[PDB]
Every structure is written in structure tokens, then in C-alpha cells.
Design an enzyme around this catalytic site. Sequence first.
Site, PDB file in Angstrom:
ATOM      1  N   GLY D  10       0.797  -1.237   0.000  1.00 16.77           N
ATOM      2  CA  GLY D  10       0.000   0.000   0.000  1.00 16.77           C
ATOM      3  C   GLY D  10       0.824   1.279   0.000  1.00 16.77           C
ATOM      4  N   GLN D  15       5.107   3.101   4.131  1.00 14.61           N
ATOM      5  CA  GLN D  15       5.596   4.135   5.047  1.00 14.61           C
ATOM      6  C   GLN D  15       6.104   3.484   6.333  1.00 14.61           C
ATOM      7  OE1 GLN D  15       5.918   7.102   3.851  1.00 14.61           O
ATOM      8  NE2 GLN D  15       4.344   7.123   2.246  1.00 14.61           N
ATOM      9  N   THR D 166     -10.533   8.951   6.895  1.00 15.51           N
ATOM     10  CA  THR D 166      -9.964   9.672   5.748  1.00 15.51           C
ATOM     11  C   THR D 166     -10.446   9.121   4.392  1.00 15.51           C
ATOM     12  OG1 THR D 166      -7.964   8.296   5.559  1.00 15.51           O
ATOM     13  CG2 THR D 166      -7.889  10.127   7.128  1.00 15.51           C
ATOM     14  N   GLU D 241       4.901 -19.110  18.068  1.00 21.10           N
ATOM     15  CA  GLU D 241       4.330 -19.196  19.408  1.00 21.10           C
ATOM     16  C   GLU D 241       3.100 -18.321  19.568  1.00 21.10           C
ATOM     17  OE1 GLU D 241       7.253 -19.285  22.853  1.00 21.10           O
ATOM     18  OE2 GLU D 241       8.694 -19.379  21.200  1.00 21.10           O
TER      19      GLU D 241
END
Lengths: 426, 426, 424, 424
Positions: D10, D15, D166, D241
Amino acid sequence: MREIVHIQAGQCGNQIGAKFWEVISDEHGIDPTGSYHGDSDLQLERINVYYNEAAGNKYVPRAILVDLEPGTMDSVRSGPFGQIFRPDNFVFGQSGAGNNWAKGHYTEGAELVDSVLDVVRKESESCDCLQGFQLTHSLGGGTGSGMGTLLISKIREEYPDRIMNTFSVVPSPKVSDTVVEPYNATLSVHQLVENTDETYCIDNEALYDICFRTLKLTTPTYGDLNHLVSATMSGVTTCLRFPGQLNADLRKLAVNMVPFPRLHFFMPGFAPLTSRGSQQYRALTVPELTQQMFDAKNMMAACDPRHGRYLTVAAVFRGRMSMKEVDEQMLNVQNKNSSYFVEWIPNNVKTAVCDIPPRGLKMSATFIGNSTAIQELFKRISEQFTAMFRRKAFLHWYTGEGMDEMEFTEAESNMNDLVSEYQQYQ
Amino acid sequence: MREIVHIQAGQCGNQIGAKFWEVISDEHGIDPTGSYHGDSDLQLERINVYYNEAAGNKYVPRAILVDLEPGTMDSVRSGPFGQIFRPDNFVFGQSGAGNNWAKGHYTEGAELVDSVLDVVRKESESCDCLQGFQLTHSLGGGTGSGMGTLLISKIREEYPDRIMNTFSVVPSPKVSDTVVEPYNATLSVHQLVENTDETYCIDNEALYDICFRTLKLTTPTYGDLNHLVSATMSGVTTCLRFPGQLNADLRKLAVNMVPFPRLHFFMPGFAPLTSRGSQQYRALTVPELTQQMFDAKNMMAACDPRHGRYLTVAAVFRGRMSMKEVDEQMLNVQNKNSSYFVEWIPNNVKTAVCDIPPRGLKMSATFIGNSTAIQELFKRISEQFTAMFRRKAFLHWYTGEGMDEMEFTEAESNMNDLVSEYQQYQ
Amino acid sequence: MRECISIHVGQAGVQIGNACWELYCLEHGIQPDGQFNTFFSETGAGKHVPRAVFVDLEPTVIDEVRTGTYRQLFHPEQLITGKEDAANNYARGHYTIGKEIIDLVLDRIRKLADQCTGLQGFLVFHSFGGGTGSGFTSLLMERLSVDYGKKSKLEFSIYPAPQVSTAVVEPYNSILTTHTTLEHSDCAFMVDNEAIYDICRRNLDIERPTYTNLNRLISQIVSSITASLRFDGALNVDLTEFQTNLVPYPRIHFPLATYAPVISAEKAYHEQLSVAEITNACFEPANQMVKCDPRHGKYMACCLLYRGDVVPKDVNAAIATIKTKRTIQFVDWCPTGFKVGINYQPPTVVPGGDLAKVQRAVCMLSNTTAIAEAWARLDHKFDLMYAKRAFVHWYVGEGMEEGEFSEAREDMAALEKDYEEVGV
Amino acid sequence: MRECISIHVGQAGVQIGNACWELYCLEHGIQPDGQFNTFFSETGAGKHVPRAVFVDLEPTVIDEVRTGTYRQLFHPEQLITGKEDAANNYARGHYTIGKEIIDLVLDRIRKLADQCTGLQGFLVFHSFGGGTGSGFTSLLMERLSVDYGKKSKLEFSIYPAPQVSTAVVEPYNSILTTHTTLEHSDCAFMVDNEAIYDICRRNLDIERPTYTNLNRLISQIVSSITASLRFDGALNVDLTEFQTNLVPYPRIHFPLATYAPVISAEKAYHEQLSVAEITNACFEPANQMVKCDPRHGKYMACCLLYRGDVVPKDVNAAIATIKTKRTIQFVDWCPTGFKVGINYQPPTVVPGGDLAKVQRAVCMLSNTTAIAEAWARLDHKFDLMYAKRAFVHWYVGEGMEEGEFSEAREDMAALEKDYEEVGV
Ligand SMILES: CC[C@H](/C=C(/C)[C@@H]1C[C@@H](OC)C[C@H](O)C(C)(C)[C@@]2(O)O[C@@H](C[C@@H](OC)[C@H](O)C(=O)O1)C[C@@H](OC)[C@H]2O)CO
Ligand SMILES: Nc1nc2c(ncn2[C@@H]2O[C@H](COP(=O)(O)OP(=O)(O)OP(=O)(O)O)[C@@H](O)[C@H]2O)c(=O)[nH]1
Ligand SMILES: Nc1nc2c(ncn2[C@@H]2O[C@H](COP(=O)(O)OP(=O)(O)OP(=O)(O)O)[C@@H](O)[C@H]2O)c(=O)[nH]1
Ligand SMILES: Nc1nc2c(ncn2[C@@H]2O[C@H](COP(=O)(O)OP(=O)(O)O)[C@@H](O)[C@H]2O)c(=O)[nH]1
Ligand SMILES: Nc1nc2c(ncn2[C@@H]2O[C@H](COP(=O)(O)OP(=O)(O)O)[C@@H](O)[C@H]2O)c(=O)[nH]1
Ligand SMILES: [Mg+2]
Ligand SMILES: [Mg+2]
């Protein structure tokens, strides 16, 4: 090896020829006095293809200049590069041809043709390995059409295993330049069908369209049109005169462009052709050049190529370029628009590349198309001819020189057969 | 990737377009001669979105300039950035359109449209991945309205899976600029309802209000109004041309702003807009910018947004700012005044942010609102149209070009349906 | 000692040969003016001269060579010339113009043979589709067969691509070549230009290529093939071994040639470039240097030529892994379907080139039923063309007969049938 | 050795990944030009290269990475690009545009796997709500499941906040993602931007934040999660785990991720920062990194990852204290509701950062019925939107069908019911 002998006949033939010799001269770095002033060794390596060397590093084009009237050739001699030609290679008569094929082919021309043949023989004897002959003429007049055809007949009889190629200026559908044009054109075309290996079909209307629509030229001169034609002509033989990645040849082009012996009438094109105003606006990419090449508006015949199918097309590229790119572009054109290419000949496009580009350009290209659309030209000529012949209009000028009706009918028959053949592959 | 092709049609369309190209040019550091003189690598990275590169580092906007009369485009060429356009991309006719939609759409425009389409195709072929088309025109005249609509129809038919967005200058409730405006607008709008993906609705009265009430400008020029419009236009595509924290896109905006396919008429806004006198008096905070954005006085359509509800609003922020702050501001607006936002779409506000701010500003924002208030414009137009049509006033000018009454009725029906749809969500 | 003679025929072949010779010079430190025995015949002045035959009917490419950088390297005879090219015409090569030059070429070859004390055989470079490379080459090969018999005759051939071409009589010529080099050539190694372009696009991250690059790539492969004759290493392969290992039946003798790693400077550092990885790359469908999917075909026999740093254990492991994969299909009748060759000498980088320096590189030669599809396609093309008797007047007008074409088609059909049988 | 592969998908994911990689570099002393095996694949020139997959359909974020500081670090392939983004459209990710790129991604993943001698599995970074991060990621996950099966597939996901957003097609996309990653992903760790902002406001005393800060915070958490693979310590936790310890039923697999101490330089000196205190902070309602009150929900299973100076006795004491509190409600059926991991290596400070140096830090991963409320809210939102068939023409216009939405809703309802059952 690979010497080419040039013959230029009649008014248009000599005029176009003058321009052609100018262009070739500049390409080879030859000045009007026959002196070399080039910067590269590539310029001289194959200079023998078009030029003969004389005492004092003089170069003399292997050109034979023919006319039945002296005016045009006097003008040529007076011209800029006129002094470069061998004086003995001007062969002329005294009486005009009156736009009369019979006078060119049977009477006035018959008296002069032997003299021309002698000169031709002399030139061919100086060739280490003569490739063939290039002729420049019009189809609609008397000298280029009748005399020119006659010369072709003679030379093919004597040199039947050499290449015979012509740049032939044909009549235009809108605005004829002589009244007997249909008769002359039909009479010439009949002979060319059987006696030439390839003919480049040039239409002055198409040239004017190019000048006005493409070049944005308000006031084209015949000189300017001639220049364009010369550029196309030079393109064809580039691979004989310079190195490359795919070295083409006249014979090679013929092999790839003529699938049946009688179908050898090509539509020539040239690229790039861009207005002086809009030069910086164009990005000179091979793709864009390809697009120009395949654009009907950039063709030099009186055809709509979209009204037929391409049997074969030969593209000759000049300058530095990616073979990958070229091939990809060719593939894209055929895949996208497979309907415009005959389906029985896979890979309808042949590409050649010569490293050395023409003056003032980084890249250029010359296009040669064998399209079934050419039938339209022939059909239109045939219609015109029949319109006259069925009334025997203007015919006494030809019968008076010994021609018979039967010849005209034969010519018509040939034309129709050609049209039928073209329609087969359409 | 993501090339956008621009079309500017008619007088207003070409004028706004000139300003837009100026603004974009300055943003990208491109001078009027197509030379780059920027200071950042970000300026060139995505220059291909609007520009095409040519020999000698020349950049040429992918713009097609269209008019039925030569005057306006002659002026454009004479103008400052006029020499930057490709000469071959000016497509024009000779006869005017007489503020007549029928002449633009059916008769005069029909004769020219094929030529435009050819240029469009040529441009689209040069796109690695064409995003879509941007059109600039007026709705009230003949060329931008009729011809422009026609172009849109053609392009959507040929490129139905690309984005088609328009900046459309509409008539203003107080002071009409032509007598047949209602007819032309209705005829255009009918076509735009079905053939465009988004339309930005610009009202000159609103622009004048902005200039006088907000900018304190005593004497606004059309140039100045155009500037504002150009700024808004640039805002929309900022996220294609520059990096960011939330990289928007045309398609993304469409996805978030169009909840039902026919409701794609947006009210644009821009911020900050502050008087030259009172510049130091304002603190340039994101909150204050947000307030400006949402102020009806800072909108560019002929609506009172408080007389309807927002279906969705898209805000595009430019410069450095806190995402936290932005989000909080958005939340505050919606919580405080939930009545002005449709309750069936939670989170009615979408935010995008681009790091690189426009010249001379640290922060700016562009506002795009899909409000049910827009129905008022349509209703008012419909009333006007009916007032004329019920008396068949001015109708002979259109029937004379082959239009029938039934088309007008269809247009009316469409309009009314649109209004009804808007009223649903109101 | 081990000695072989190169033959370069046409334009394309000559171009390839130039690149090859450059590469050889770079490898063995020979200057462009001649200042090894396997390829370079040594004379009494500290001067090394290539042992090659350079033939072209058009005097252009040869002329370029004669004027260019490596003019002093080559002999003034090895570079042979004609007067007019065949012009994409098998008939003008095989019958008309070739029988003027062929004798001279033969003489040259004989001379070269005489200068050797153990001629391993021949490496020939031509092109299926070109006029000279089709007919003339075929003629030469026949003559060689008549003369030497049991000397290795390896061919390097530029196969016409399916979706792209540069000549509209290319099906005919290629077919003719196939017909008349089926009972002579022992191996005919294959490269395709479209495939190379694809490789460039994908692996190298270069999308503005030219013929020179392609030639260089081909030369690398050639060097890899011939590296065992000129350097030490475990598993020194011979030119005579290829025939034994890649030709199960005498008609079936067209194996594909692929090279790994073909990669630029940027992702040479990112990649590990281990042996196993390289091996895997070699068998990947997209990395192959022709337009064929080896998923649509069973591998008869494969030959791997590792060059540089290679622990044989690693190679073995890689091979085992390959065998394990379901997907990479082999024929029922060939379980042992691998030949392995190793050299201590690494690959050599050509200044102003595409490829960076590597520790280890691999060249794979694979004989598979995937080429059958290609053959079929070619046949179909031929059929489409010949049904209307297109271009036939050119070929018939210089020697050929109506009937020869039919015979060729029959031969092709037989070949296809054989391939099908092998597949079972 | 222990090796894992990161996948970043994405804008948001990419980022986050940048930040993560920076953090990793800071930890292991690797320079931005590459000058550990767990994350960095080592090559033969003293060069370390990340073992990640970087995917975006829009070529902008990736381009930024390619031009920025750490361009030489990453491979020219690991960073993959497209042409046009999904534009908040699950359908353009999962059906239309994703099936162009997915194959390449898969190939890359396979290659990476091949380069490992013990692949623990995958770490994936995406976003519920985004166009690419919803659909494309889902598609990828399905493919991975089909391929590997029993390789760990951990997800790091940006959950949409309740009172802020957003994008106004965010409910749909998220729902779709939930539907199509319920039978594939083993763990989906959750972070919420609003929560992070709140944390910043409260603990850090900073009220002008940006995405970068958030990313850094996320990266810290990621590092904490992965610190046991790369350093020594008592109680070395594995990626395998987490699945065992935090997933009581296969549908129920969304645990919240929180970090302590998230504190600035000023009140780092005031605070003692003992183990017990940190533990207490971890379980506090406001300190959690999503918008949910864990007072309105029973803790099924919790996992604590102490990093730095920690006497295990102290940790035990803290845990006991937590257990004592009435409130902190646990389920009836899970008495042992704690997993403890310890590392000697402390946290690492990023220059120009929000956080100061600490002796000891803790990361808590908790699976609870508090997220049920959030799910319900999301469902309600979806219902509100879908009742009028809003935006559906976009999704249906690229692949989807009316009915799929209904199915998704049903699935969500089932999930809610399951949660309710667990609560009892
Ligand atoms: C392939 C053989 C070939 C046939 C076709 C149809 C070819 C294909 C494409 O060119 C390669 C067209 C091309 O891609 C364009 C669209 C950019 C374009 O050049 O098309 C023409 C009109 C088109 O005919 C319609 C043209 O005349 C033509 O010849 O087109 C207008 C022109 O205005 C700028 C521009 O719009 C004939 O030789
Ligand atoms: N890879 C590569 N292929 C080439 C080169 N030159 C030509 N070709 C290919 O070879 C084929 C054409 O054959 P050429 O070798 O040019 O023809 P020729 O052997 O000279 O024969 P004629 O010219 O017909 O007498 C086409 O498929 C070209 O793409 C080259 O330098 N490299
Ligand atoms: N924490 C954090 N959240 C982000 C970042 N970038 C985007 N987001 C969030 O992710 C969601 C939007 O998804 P994106 O990842 O931007 O969308 P995408 O995956 O690129 O998909 P399309 O753009 O729709 O193709 C919103 O909730 C954003 O707040 C980031 O860098 N950090
Ligand atoms: N392109 C071109 N056409 C010419 C030129 N001169 C004459 N023509 C054309 O040639 C035809 C007339 O034939 P022309 O050569 O003058 O007659 P000839 O001397 O009897 O062969 C007409 O179609 C003219 O338009 C010229 O210099 N260039
Ligand atoms: N904002 C703006 N409006 C304009 C401009 N020029 C004309 N208009 C408006 O456009 C409408 C008239 O249409 P116009 O574009 O001139 O007619 P056309 O050439 O037939 O399309 C009126 O509403 C004018 O106020 C301009 O430069 N800017
Ligand atoms: Mg040749
Ligand atoms: Mg994105």
C-alpha cells in the site's frame, strides 16, 4: 561492385534527375565541379555506385540525359550542378514530341534510340559488376512516356538479368496536365507491366497535399516537390552506398516486395516531414516516425491506402536506432490492424537500417508499399481512356504515326487484367 | 504512468485553459519556451502527467485547443505562454457558433469533430498509461456547450473505461450573459449527466463575490477570475504530480465523492484567499484554513450550501501539516454540525495531503463538495427554460438545424429527474 | 593439440564473429594488431592470427571489418568477398552464386586443417532466413560432409521468431535450409532475437537495445561452449561430446542455448548469485533464449557448462533439486538427462558492455520437444505462403523446381511425426 | 537459522516499512548503503540486503523510496510497482488490477524462501480501508495459504477509527477484507491512528503530530515483537508461538498491540520506570493503541514482551498484581492468560525522534472481547451505507456481485455471535 546507371528522359525526368544528382552529390560531399570535400571515409568507400572517377580526382555521375527537344537539357546545363555531367552523355533530338506517345516510341524516338543505346552500352562496359538501371520520367507526355518506355524495352532485351527500376510520375485524378494523358499513360503502363522489375508511382497531387497539409508550405515550387522525390530515391539505394545493421539492396527489396511478377507498382513515402514552424514541438522517436510512415497523408501516390490491403511494405531506416524498438513497432502495427495486411503473407513488413543519416537529420525513413489500393489509379485511368477511345477522340494523331486500334485494345486488356489481379488480393 | 489529456473548447474554455497552462507551467518550473528552470527534482519526476518531452529538453503540454471561430485562439497564441503549445494542436473552424448549441453539436461542430478526434487519438497513443481527459468549457454558449459536449460523447464512446472530468462554467442567477443560455445549458447538462464522471460547477457571480467580499478587489479582471479557477484545477491533480502523506488521485476522489452515478456535480473552493491589505493580520493555521474552506462565501457555485446537505466532501491539503490536526478538525466539523451532512454516509469528509505547496504559500487547500443544494441551480435553470419553451421562444434557430421538440422535452425530463434525485437525499 | 576452426557466413554471422573475436582477444590478452593454439594460429614474430573463415557475397560487412579496429588481426584471405548478395534467396545461394565462391572457401578450410595437428572440427555461424546464410551455408556444409565426414560440424543459427521478422520470404529459406542441413550438421544451436529482447527487458532492465548487444550476448554463450578447450578445470568438455550427448536420433539435432546470469550492475549486488539459483534460472521459461515454453515439451537431454567458482557438490545438489521438480518434465527413455562441465576460468567483461563482472556463470544447451511447436508454426506459415505460389518465380527463376517445396514440406511433416513419437 | 520475510503493501504499509527498516539498520549498525540473517540477507561483498517484498499499485511511494536515503539498501525488485492504484476499491485490488501483479509478487516470495534455511514465515503490513491494502493483500494472503500452508502468516493492520476517518468507502473495504482474511491469516495485529494521537496528547505531551511519528511508534512495536529472533535473552519467543498462545478459536484472531513506556525526555527523569509500573501502564484503558475500553470486555489471552533490564521475579510479581485486580476481567476458561518474553537487548533511539532512551520497555499483545464492540460499530456503519446501495456500482462495476455484501454481513454477524459466546 554494384554500379547503378541512371537514365533521365523528357522534361520532368530531366528536372527530377537534376535535383536527384544535387542531393546525391551533397550526400557524398561532391561539389559541382566534381571535387570531394567530405569529412568521412564512408563518403568515398562506395562512391562508385553512382559516380565514375576521372583525372584530377574528378567524379562524373553515370547519368544519361535524354530528350527530343533541347530546351530542358539546356536549362539543366545552365543550372547549378549542370557542369558536373559528362557533355557526351546529353543525347537529344531536334523535333518535339507533342505529348504524343507514338512520336516518342515509334517515330521521332525510334530515330534517336540507337544513339542512346550506344551510350548505355559504353557505360555498362565500365561497370565491374553492374547492378542495374534507374529511370526517371513522366507517364503522361510523349518523350518520357514513349521514348522512355522504348529505352526500357531495349535495355531489358540486352540486359535481361539486371534490375530495371523506374520513378514514374503519373497523372492525378483531379487536375490533369495534358488532354491526351490517359492515352499516353495507358500506352506506357502496358509496356512497363512487362518490361520493368519495379516502378515507384509518384502523383503530383499527393506531393502538393504533402507540401500544404504536412509541411505547411504556402507556395511550393516544382523544385521543392522534386527535392522530396529525390529524397525518396536516395533512400532506396542507401544500403548500397553506406554500412548498416541490416544492409538492404535493390534486388532484396524486389524479392520481398513483389510476390507476383506483374504486381510491382509501389507507393513511396518519406519521413520525417515537418513544418519549419513546428520543429521543436515534435519528439523524433522511432515510433512517431513509424506512424508518419504509415499515415496515408504521408504517401506520394493518388491512393487511399485504407481502401485496400498491403501485400508487402519495405521500410528503410537511416540513423542510429534500436532494432528491438523497430521490430516491436512493426509487430504492433500488424497485430493492431491485421485487416489492412493480406493474411496469406505472414510478416508483411520488411525492415532495413543504414547507420549514416541524411544531412540535417538524426533519423529518417523511406517507405515502399505494395498495396492493392493502387488498382484505383489504374481503374480511373482505364475509365478515362475508354471514354475517349469509344469515340476515337484524338486518335488520328496516333494512327498518323502508324499505330493501329488493336494496340489500344491490347493496352486496355492488359490494364483490366492487372486490375483484376489486384482485386484478387483485395 | 498516469498521463492526463487536456481539451479546451470555445472562448471561455480556451481562456481559462491558457491561465491553467500558465499556472501549471510555473509550478513545474517550465518557462514559456518549454525550458525547465526549477530547483527541485520533484519538479520533473511526474512532469509527464501534463507535458510531453521533445528534442532539446522541450516540454509541450498535452493540450488540444478547439474553436469554431479563430479569434480567441489567435489571441491565445499571441499571449505569453501561447508559443508553448503544439501548433498542430490548434483545431479550428471558420464559421462562428452564434451561442447556438445546435450549431456546436449537430451542424458546424459535426463537421470539425472528426479532426479533433484524430488529434485526441494521436495524443492517447503517446500515453504509457492514460488516466483520462480534462475538459474546460462554458455551458451557456454554442461551441463549449454544443461542440464540447459532442467531443465528450465521442471520447467516452471510444475510451469508456477512462476518467472524463470537466470544469464547466455555468450561468448565474442574477445576470445572464446570453438570452438563449437556459436552452444551451439544459442541452449540455442533459448530455453531461450521462457522459461524464465528474463536473466541477463554476459560477462567475460566485467568483465576483469572492473577488469583492473576500479578496477586497475593487476591479477584478476575467484574468483574475481565471487565475482562481486555475488554482482550483491544479489542486485536484496535485497528488498525481507530487509526493505526499495521503496520495490522492482523480479516480479515488470520484470513488469517494460519487455515491450514485448521476450525482457528480461538485462545488469547488480554494483557500486561503486573503486581501493584500490584511495578510499579516491572519494566522495561517490548519483550523482557520478549514473554516475558510467550509465557508459558503468561499464557494465557487451559485448555491447556498446551508440550503442543503453535503453527501460527501473531499479536501486536498497542500504543504506541511499535522495529520492529527487535520483529522481532528474534520471530526469537529461533522460532530458540531451533523445536520449539514447526510446521516446515511458516516465520515462524509475525505482528506488528502500533498507535501509540496503552491508558490508563495506555506499551506493551501482545495475543497470539492457534493451538496444537495446544487438542485437549486438546476431547478432555476428548468424554470427559465420552461418559461421560454412553453411559448416556443427562440426555437426556430434550433429547429432550423434539425432539432425536434421531443429532444427539448427529454432534456427537461432528465433535469427534473436529477432534481428529484437530489431532493431524495435532501 | 586441441584445435578448432570457425566459419562465419552472411551479415549476421559476420557481426557475431566480430564480437566473438573481440571476446577471445580480451580473454587471451592479444592486442588488436595480433601482439591459444585452439583458436589463434601462432607465427614466427610474436603474432597471433585467428583460425577462421569469413564469407559474404555482398562486399560491405567484410569491408567494414577490413577497415575497422581489428583489421591487422585478421588475414587478407580468411576475410573472403563476393560481388552481389543472394537477397533473401536460397536459390541464389545454394545453386547460382554460391558455386562461384565455394571452391575458394573449401580450399581455405583445407589449408587451415593442414595447419592443425588434431582438428576437433568446425564451428559455423549463419542464419535461417537470410539469403546467404540459408543456401550458401547449406552448400558449404554438404561439401564439408563429403570431404571430412567424421570431423565435428557444429552450427550456431539465428532462428526466425514467431511474432516478429525482418523479411517476407523467411519461411521458405529456413525450410529449405532445414531440408538440406538435416543429413549433414551434427548440432545446430539456436538463438532468437525476440527472446533476447525479452530477456533484456526483464533481467537486465534495459529497453533500448541494439544488434551489437545481442551479438555480445551470443559471443558470451559461444565462449562458454568453447571455454573447456582453452582452460583447465574439472570435467573438461569437448566439441565431440556434444554430439554424443545431445543427439538421441540423427534427424533430431536442434538444441536451445541459454545463459545465466544475464544481469546488470544494479541487481548483481542484491542477488547472491549462488550455483543453485543460477541453475534454477537456466530452467525458467522466460529466461530461455527462444520463443517456446518448455512446459509444453519434455526435455530429452540437457548439457550444463558451469564457468568460474563452482563446488561440484553444489552443482550436484542443484541438479538433484531440478530433477525433483514435477513441472520440469523429462522423457521416459532418458533418466540420466544431464551433462556437466566445469572451468576454473571465470567470464570476461567487455568494455562499454551490458554485463557486469561475476564470480560464476552457466551456459545450458537443451534438446527438447518444445521446438516441435515452433517447427509446426513455421510449417503452417510456409503452407499459407506457398498455397498461392507467392514469390516462387524468384526461386524457380534461378535453379529450383516446383516439387522441391513439396518434398521439403514432407520432410518437415516427418520430422514433426518423429518429435511426436519421441514425446510418447 | 531463524529467518523471516517482510511484506509491505500500500502507501501506509510502505511508510511503516521504511520506518521499520530504519530502526533495524540503527539496531544492527548497517549503513544506508548496506555496509542479522533473520532480516538481512548477506552477500559476498560485506553488503547486507533486506529480505522484504514492497508492493504498490500506484508508482509514487515506491518511487520516493527509490530516490531517498535508503535507496542503495533495497534491491531493484523487492520494490515492485504498478501503474494505477485501486482508489479505495477492494474490487480493483482483489479482482481486476491485482491479478496482473500478484504472480510477480508470488515469484519474489518464492525466491526469498529459497534463499532461507528455516523460514519462520511472513510479516505483512497493510491497511483495512485502503484500496490496495484491502483487496490486493487479501489476494496475496490467499495465494500464500494455498502455497505454504504451515508457514506463519502474521499481519500488521491499521484499523479504521470510530469517530474519525480519511475515506468514505472505508466500511465496505474493511468488511470485505475481514471476510476474505478470516480463513487465511493466523494473527492480525491492530493499531488505530486516533488512539495513537490520544496517546501522544496524554503521555508524550505532544499535540502537533504527523504520520511519521505514528510510523515510528508502530516500528518500535514491530521491533519488540521481532527482538527475540535477533538477540539473546531468557524466554526467547518465536513467530510460531504467537499463533499458539493468542488464537483460542481459528476465526477469533485479532489482538491489540500496545507499548510502554511511550514517554518524552521531560518526565522520563521524574518517573522511576520500574517493571511493575510499566506492566500496569500496559493494562490501562487510555494507554491502549485502539479506540476500545477493555473494561467492556474479558481478556482471553495476553502476551507480554519485556525488552531490556528485567529481573524475571519482578515481572512475575507484576503479573500477580495484575491478576489480583478485580477490574481487569479474564474469561472463565483461560486461567493461565499470560505469555512472557524477555530480551537483554534494550530499545534503540532514532535520531530526530519522539522517544528518549530507556532502560527497559514492554510490548503487550492482547486478544479480548473488547474488539467485538468495534466490529459491531463497523457492521452498523456498513448497514447504514449499504441500505441505500451507495457506492455499490463502483465495486459491482469491476467484478463484485450483489449478494457478496450480504454474505460478508452474515459472516460478521456469526463472528459477533462467537464473541458473545466466548464472553459467557
Ligand atoms: C497500418 C496501415 C495504415 C492504416 C491505418 C488505419 C493507420 C493507422 C494509424 O497510423 C499508423 C493511425 C494513427 O495511429 C493515428 C490515429 C495517430 C492518426 O495518424 O490517424 C490518422 C487517420 C489514419 O487513418 C484512419 C491514418 O491516415 C492512417 O493511415 O492510419 C489521422 C491522424 O491525425 C493526426 C492520427 O489520428 C495505412 O497505411
Ligand atoms: N543477432 C543478430 N541477428 C542478425 C544480425 N544481422 C542479421 N541478423 C538476422 O539475420 C536475419 C537476416 O539474415 P542476414 O544474415 O542479414 O542475411 P545474409 O546472410 O546476409 O543474406 P542476404 O543478405 O540475404 O544475402 C534476420 O533474421 C536478422 O534479424 C546480427 O548482427 N545479429
Ligand atoms: N499509520 C499510518 N497510517 C496510514 C499511513 N498512510 C495511510 N494510512 C492510513 O491508511 C488508510 C488509507 O490506506 P492507504 O494505505 O493510504 O491506501 P492504499 O493501500 O494505498 O490503497 P489505495 O490508495 O486505495 O490504492 C487510512 O486509514 C490512512 O490513515 C501511514 O503512513 N501511517
Ligand atoms: N514532379 C514534377 N512533375 C513534372 C515536372 N515537370 C513536368 N512535370 C509533370 O510531368 C507531366 C508532363 O510531362 P513532361 O515530362 O513535361 O512531358 P515530356 O517532356 O513529353 O515527357 C505532367 O504531369 C507535369 O505535371 C517536374 O519538374 N516535377
Ligand atoms: N470565468 C470566465 N468566464 C468566461 C470567460 N469568457 C467567457 N466567459 C463566460 O462564458 C459564457 C459565454 O460563453 P463563451 O465561452 O464565451 O461562448 P462560446 O465561445 O460559444 O463557448 C458566459 O457565461 C461568460 O461570462 C472567461 O475568460 N472566464
Ligand atoms: Mg548479406
Ligand atoms: Mg495507495
